[PDB]
Design a protein around this ligand. Structure first.
Ligand SMILES: O=C(O)CNC(=O)C(=O)O
Ligand SMILES: [Mn+2]
Length: 211
């Protein structure tokens, strides 16, 4: 049981790469742009499916977005707004330059914006929708990304995740293999003490089922 948790954590770690790529100034500039997105959404300037509002977490879908169990679908072409130029210029370019992902890979950029006490429940990034690797960049504050999220449903039987990964402002997280496909991830509400935002950069699959 203890050996099993250590083996799983080793497997999770084999599919995680992390690096501090964005300076405090670079973060400040990107954070200003994220604020612009929030403002534009509030002004009703985005397409219908670009904005997903939920109690303590908003999602903003660019390039491609998605919606019983395990049957998410891509919205028809042109339903979501295009990836903003600043995302290419300030975020994707930096990633390509540092050999994190190849040029042309990213066709989907999602911004998650969290209130204090916000969270995201146990999930796997839909395997029928997105290629791997999955890249994420964190912005306003530091937090943690948990892996193996049974604890969110069975706190008596299991109190802790398999692994908790610190995700600092300006850090890039790359998920692949076991970490992206074989285990769930989540964020605990106690780990978001102040506003936090994340830009998730992915490539959708050719055969991603569409509406
Ligand atoms: O906010 C984060 O760091 C993680 N968010 C997600 O896992 C997601 O939107 O798929
Ligand atoms: Mn996810």
């Amino acid at each position: 049981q203890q050996l099993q948790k250590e083996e799983e954590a080793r497997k999770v770690k084999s599919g995680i790469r992390q690096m501090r790529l964005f300076s405090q100034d670079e973060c400040a500039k990107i954070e200003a742009r994220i604020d612009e997105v929030v403002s534009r959404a509030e002004k009703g300037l985005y397409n219908e499916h670009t904005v997903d509002r939920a109690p303590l977490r908003n999602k903003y879908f660019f390039g491609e977005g998605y919606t019983g169990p395990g049957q998410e679908r891509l919205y028809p072409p042109g339903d979501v707004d295009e990836i903003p130029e600043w995302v290419h210029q300030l975020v994707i370019q930096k990633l390509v330059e540092h050999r994190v992902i190849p040029e042309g890979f990213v066709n989907s950029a999602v911004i998650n914006d969290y209130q204090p006490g916000g969270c995201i429940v146990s999930h796997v990034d839909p395997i029928h929708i997105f290629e791997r690797p999955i890249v994420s960049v964190s912005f306003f504050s530091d937090s943690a990304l948990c892996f193996g999220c049974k604890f969110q449903f069975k706190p008596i039987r299991v109190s802790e995740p398999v692994l908790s990964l610190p995700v600092r402002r300006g850090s890039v997280t790359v998920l692949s293999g076991y970490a992206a496909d074989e285990i769930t991830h989540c964020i605990r509400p106690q780990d978001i003490k102040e506003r936090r935002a994340v830009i998730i950069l992915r490539k959708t699959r050719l055969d991603a089922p569409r509406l």
